[PDB]
Design an enzyme around this catalytic site. Structure first.
Site, PDB file in Angstrom:
ATOM      1  N   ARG A 174       0.858  -1.180   0.000  1.00 51.60           N
ATOM      2  CA  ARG A 174       0.000   0.000   0.000  1.00 51.60           C
ATOM      3  C   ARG A 174       0.894   1.230   0.000  1.00 51.60           C
ATOM      4  O   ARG A 174       1.553   1.524   1.004  1.00 51.60           O
ATOM      5  CB  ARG A 174      -0.934   0.014   1.210  1.00 51.60           C
ATOM      6  CG  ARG A 174      -1.889   1.213   1.210  1.00 51.60           C
ATOM      7  CD  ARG A 174      -2.709   1.315   2.492  1.00 51.60           C
ATOM      8  NE  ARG A 174      -3.721   0.268   2.609  1.00 51.60           N
ATOM      9  CZ  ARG A 174      -4.598   0.222   3.606  1.00 51.60           C
ATOM     10  NH1 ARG A 174      -4.579   1.116   4.585  1.00 51.60           N
ATOM     11  NH2 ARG A 174      -5.530  -0.733   3.612  1.00 51.60           N
ATOM     12  N   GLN A 223       3.598   1.608   2.921  1.00 52.41           N
ATOM     13  CA  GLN A 223       3.232   0.640   3.950  1.00 52.41           C
ATOM     14  C   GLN A 223       3.525  -0.779   3.473  1.00 52.41           C
ATOM     15  O   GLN A 223       3.237  -1.133   2.321  1.00 52.41           O
ATOM     16  CB  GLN A 223       1.742   0.791   4.304  1.00 52.41           C
ATOM     17  CG  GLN A 223       1.233  -0.213   5.336  1.00 52.41           C
ATOM     18  CD  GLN A 223      -0.222   0.040   5.697  1.00 52.41           C
ATOM     19  OE1 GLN A 223      -0.745   1.145   5.495  1.00 52.41           O
ATOM     20  NE2 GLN A 223      -0.885  -0.973   6.219  1.00 52.41           N
TER      21      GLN A 223
HETATM   22  C1  LIG Z   1     -12.619  -1.298  10.713  1.00 53.47           C
HETATM   23  C2  LIG Z   1     -11.190  -1.287  10.164  1.00 53.47           C
HETATM   24  C3  LIG Z   1     -10.582  -2.638  10.448  1.00 53.47           C
HETATM   25  O1  LIG Z   1     -10.790  -3.227  11.508  1.00 53.47           O
HETATM   26  N1  LIG Z   1      -9.798  -3.169   9.522  1.00 53.47           N
HETATM   27  C4  LIG Z   1      -9.292  -4.528   9.664  1.00 53.47           C
HETATM   28  C5  LIG Z   1      -8.557  -4.728   8.362  1.00 53.47           C
HETATM   29  C6  LIG Z   1      -8.146  -3.331   7.916  1.00 53.47           C
HETATM   30  C7  LIG Z   1      -6.897  -2.874   8.636  1.00 53.47           C
HETATM   31  O2  LIG Z   1      -6.975  -2.154   9.626  1.00 53.47           O
HETATM   32  N2  LIG Z   1      -5.725  -3.288   8.132  1.00 53.47           N
HETATM   33  C8  LIG Z   1      -5.576  -4.026   6.876  1.00 53.47           C
HETATM   34  C9  LIG Z   1      -4.505  -2.840   8.830  1.00 53.47           C
HETATM   35  C10 LIG Z   1      -4.061  -1.555   8.154  1.00 53.47           C
HETATM   36  O3  LIG Z   1      -3.666  -1.565   6.987  1.00 53.47           O
HETATM   37  N3  LIG Z   1      -4.189  -0.432   8.866  1.00 53.47           N
HETATM   38  C11 LIG Z   1      -3.965   0.892   8.307  1.00 53.47           C
HETATM   39  C12 LIG Z   1      -5.176   1.800   8.593  1.00 53.47           C
HETATM   40  C13 LIG Z   1      -6.190   1.728   7.457  1.00 53.47           C
HETATM   41  C14 LIG Z   1      -6.717   0.506   7.070  1.00 53.47           C
HETATM   42  C15 LIG Z   1      -7.632   0.437   6.030  1.00 53.47           C
HETATM   43  O4  LIG Z   1      -8.078  -0.801   5.681  1.00 53.47           O
HETATM   44  C16 LIG Z   1      -8.023   1.615   5.369  1.00 53.47           C
HETATM   45  C17 LIG Z   1      -7.513   2.857   5.763  1.00 53.47           C
HETATM   46  C18 LIG Z   1      -6.580   2.904   6.807  1.00 53.47           C
HETATM   47  C19 LIG Z   1      -7.923   4.101   5.026  1.00 53.47           C
HETATM   48  C20 LIG Z   1      -9.106   4.097   4.271  1.00 53.47           C
HETATM   49  C21 LIG Z   1      -9.453   5.244   3.547  1.00 53.47           C
HETATM   50  C22 LIG Z   1      -8.637   6.367   3.548  1.00 53.47           C
HETATM   51  C23 LIG Z   1      -7.455   6.365   4.281  1.00 53.47           C
HETATM   52  C24 LIG Z   1      -7.096   5.229   5.011  1.00 53.47           C
HETATM   53  C25 LIG Z   1      -6.829   7.605   4.112  1.00 53.47           C
HETATM   54  C26 LIG Z   1      -7.732   8.352   3.218  1.00 53.47           C
HETATM   55  C27 LIG Z   1      -7.547   9.760   2.756  1.00 53.47           C
HETATM   56  C28 LIG Z   1      -7.637  10.762   3.721  1.00 53.47           C
HETATM   57  C29 LIG Z   1      -7.476  12.091   3.327  1.00 53.47           C
HETATM   58  C30 LIG Z   1      -7.234  12.376   1.988  1.00 53.47           C
HETATM   59  N4  LIG Z   1      -7.143  11.407   1.068  1.00 53.47           N
HETATM   60  C31 LIG Z   1      -7.294  10.107   1.419  1.00 53.47           C
HETATM   61  C32 LIG Z   1      -7.191   9.110   0.336  1.00 53.47           C
HETATM   62  C33 LIG Z   1      -5.926   9.329  -0.500  1.00 53.47           C
HETATM   63  O5  LIG Z   1      -8.321   9.291  -0.506  1.00 53.47           O
HETATM   64  C34 LIG Z   1      -8.608   8.136  -1.284  1.00 53.47           C
HETATM   65  N5  LIG Z   1      -8.774   7.548   2.923  1.00 53.47           N
HETATM   66  C35 LIG Z   1      -9.958   7.910   2.136  1.00 53.47           C
HETATM   67  C36 LIG Z   1     -10.959   8.427   3.171  1.00 53.47           C
HETATM   68  C37 LIG Z   1      -5.557   8.115   4.762  1.00 53.47           C
HETATM   69  C38 LIG Z   1      -4.223   7.863   4.077  1.00 53.47           C
HETATM   70  C39 LIG Z   1      -3.132   8.558   4.899  1.00 53.47           C
HETATM   71  C40 LIG Z   1      -4.185   8.479   2.684  1.00 53.47           C
HETATM   72  C41 LIG Z   1      -3.928   6.377   3.979  1.00 53.47           C
HETATM   73  O6  LIG Z   1      -3.740   5.894   5.298  1.00 53.47           O
HETATM   74  C42 LIG Z   1      -3.327   4.569   5.449  1.00 53.47           C
HETATM   75  O7  LIG Z   1      -3.341   3.831   4.492  1.00 53.47           O
HETATM   76  C43 LIG Z   1      -2.915   4.247   6.838  1.00 53.47           C
HETATM   77  C44 LIG Z   1      -1.665   5.076   7.182  1.00 53.47           C
HETATM   78  C45 LIG Z   1      -1.098   4.649   8.539  1.00 53.47           C
HETATM   79  C46 LIG Z   1      -0.863   3.145   8.543  1.00 53.47           C
HETATM   80  N6  LIG Z   1      -2.101   2.476   8.128  1.00 53.47           N
HETATM   81  N7  LIG Z   1      -2.648   2.801   6.937  1.00 53.47           N
HETATM   82  C47 LIG Z   1      -2.710   1.538   8.861  1.00 53.47           C
HETATM   83  O8  LIG Z   1      -2.269   1.235   9.977  1.00 53.47           O
HETATM   84  C48 LIG Z   1      -3.389  -3.903   8.880  1.00 53.47           C
HETATM   85  C49 LIG Z   1      -2.214  -3.372   9.699  1.00 53.47           C
HETATM   86  C50 LIG Z   1      -3.872  -5.211   9.483  1.00 53.47           C
HETATM   87  C51 LIG Z   1      -9.339  -2.479   8.319  1.00 53.47           C
END
Ligand SMILES: *CCC(=O)N1CC[C@H](C(=O)N(C)[C@H](C(=O)N[C@H]2Cc3cc(O)cc(c3)-c3ccc4c(c3)c(c(-c3cccnc3[C@H](C)OC)n4CC)CC(C)(C)COC(=O)[C@@H]3CCCN(N3)C2=O)C(C)C)C1
Ligand SMILES: Nc1nc2c(ncn2[C@@H]2O[C@H](COP(=O)(O)OP(=O)(O)NP(=O)(O)O)[C@@H](O)[C@H]2O)c(=O)[nH]1
Ligand SMILES: [Cl-]
EC number: 5.2.1.8
Lengths: 165, 170
Positions: free
Chosen positions: A55, A63
């Site tokens: 990711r 990530q």
């Molecule tokens: C209910 C959730 C749950 O229990 N889950 C179990 C499986 C899954 C999960 O937690 N995992 C697979 C984790 C993991 O990867 N943890 C991630 C946190 C996470 C997880 C998932 O699945 C989605 C998101 C975060 C997520 C979804 C939508 C997002 C988003 C993150 C961001 C944005 C965003 C915000 C502002 C502006 N633009 C955007 C994006 C670019 O627009 C499309 N959106 C849309 C609302 C924020 C980020 C910073 C862009 C992306 O953030 C991440 O990907 C985070 C960053 C910190 C580390 N992360 N990921 C996690 O820890 C596994 C570890 C098991 C869900």
């Protein structure tokens, strides 16, 4: 007493991209740093080598660390499947910060992320435990394979990893 | 002629938002969970003899990014509120989604359908009657679906389209 440093040899569809090294803040976050260190050497019989950066979202982070399911949902720590948030002393201050991914409180496993910008809204929720030492330019290159939904345009992997002297 | 609708799928993580959308668009299901960040799909369909382009925004189940969430709700013309029948917390979240939509739209009358997904599973924790009663209290349709067997998938999306069509032409 000196914090350990680990290295990641990054590959793109198997071809070398470059090396990223990290300082692990064993001095202030010892349990979390030790997990990442041991996962990087593979000394417990499992760890990061071969796993992908699944990711990557430009402007935010790279990530990785799912070596158990290979699909973004897995990973495990050296302490069990999950371990508690150790402390929140350190913050997501800018590019190169190394922090634990999670699925809510006290769910640290092996997944981690490297910030490519300040991500202060994660402060107090994700445990910061290290930073990029050398190779931020390699991290910037990895970031270019990402996209808005995190999918990568080629397979970005940890072809080799270990601990430096 | 043709019409086009912006449909938004919301609900707690893991309830089957993506599986429902992929069944509607691509006619298949897989057990593997690929957690969503954000995905959009477009498909031409015929509903009650009327051709339409469906634009489907498949959102992540997350509660940390309120500005993005609010924009999804500002632009969306209709909402699928999805819970899973074996996830009580996901059902308890439903009223939060409706409150948020009403807040952003500044309206009590917004097209939406309540969807109880995973109806194939024998691990139910949410009674059908409780979901029926909640939807009736909101004045919105309720449908039970399974993305695995495809039960109710077309009906859930087409019911939402009918709710939008009615709202637009009334
Ligand atoms: C209910 C959730 C749950 O229990 N889950 C179990 C499986 C899954 C999960 O937690 N995992 C697979 C984790 C993991 O990867 N943890 C991630 C946190 C996470 C997880 C998932 O699945 C989605 C998101 C975060 C997520 C979804 C939508 C997002 C988003 C993150 C961001 C944005 C965003 C915000 C502002 C502006 N633009 C955007 C994006 C670019 O627009 C499309 N959106 C849309 C609302 C924020 C980020 C910073 C862009 C992306 O953030 C991440 O990907 C985070 C960053 C910190 C580390 N992360 N990921 C996690 O820890 C596994 C570890 C098991 C869900
Ligand atoms: N038995 C069964 N499993 C289902 C059903 N719908 C989804 N699943 C399963 O439930 C898991 C999560 O589904 P998914 O569609 O990814 O959920 P989501 O609501 O999109 N999650 P997210 O908010 O993280 O994007 C997957 O393993 C999927 O196969 C269903 O109707 N029946
Ligand atoms: Cl997040």
């Amino acid at each position: 007493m000196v914090n350990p440093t680990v290295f990641f040899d990054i590959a793109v569809d198997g071809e070398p991209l470059g090396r990223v090294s990290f300082e692990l803040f064993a001095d202030k976050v010892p349990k979390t740093a030790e997990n990442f260190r041991a996962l990087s050497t593979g000394e417990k019989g499992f760890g990061y080598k071969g796993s992908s950066f699944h990711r990557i979202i430009p402007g935010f982070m790279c990530q990785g660390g799912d070596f158990t399911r290979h699909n973004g949902t897995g990973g495990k720590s050296i302490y069990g499947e999950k371990f508690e948030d150790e402390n929140f002393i350190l913050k997501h201050t800018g590019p190169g910060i190394l922090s634990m991914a999670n699925a809510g409180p006290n769910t640290n496993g092996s997944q981690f992320f490297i910030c490519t910008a300040k991500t202060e809204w994660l402060d107090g929720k994700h445990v910061v435990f290290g930073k990029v030492k050398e190779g931020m330019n390699i991290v910037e290159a990895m970031e270019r394979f990402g996209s808005r939904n995190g999918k990568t345009s080629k397979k970005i992997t940890i072809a080799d990893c270990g601990q430096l002297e | 002629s043709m019409t086009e609708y912006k449909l938004v799928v919301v609900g707690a993580c893991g309830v089957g938002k993506s599986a429902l959308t992929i069944q509607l668009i691509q006619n298949h299901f897989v057990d593997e969970y690929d957690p969503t960040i954000e995905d959009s799909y477009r498909k031409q369909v015929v509903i009650d003899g009327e051709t339409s382009l469906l634009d489907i925004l498949d959102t992540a189940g997350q509660e940390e990014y309120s500005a993005m969430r609010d924009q999804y709700m500002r632009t969306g013309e209709g909402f699928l509120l999805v819970f899973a029948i074996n996830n009580t917390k996901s059902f308890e979240d439903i009223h939060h989604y409706r409150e948020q939509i009403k807040r952003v739209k500044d309206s009590e009358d917004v097209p939406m359908v309540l969807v109880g997904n995973k109806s194939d599973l024998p691990s139910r924790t949410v009674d059908t009657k409780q979901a029926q009663d909640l939807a009736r209290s909101y004045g919105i349709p309720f449908i039970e679906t399974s993305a695995k067997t495809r039960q109710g998938v077309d009906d859930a999306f087409y019911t939402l389209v009918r709710e939008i069509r009615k709202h637009k032409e009334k």
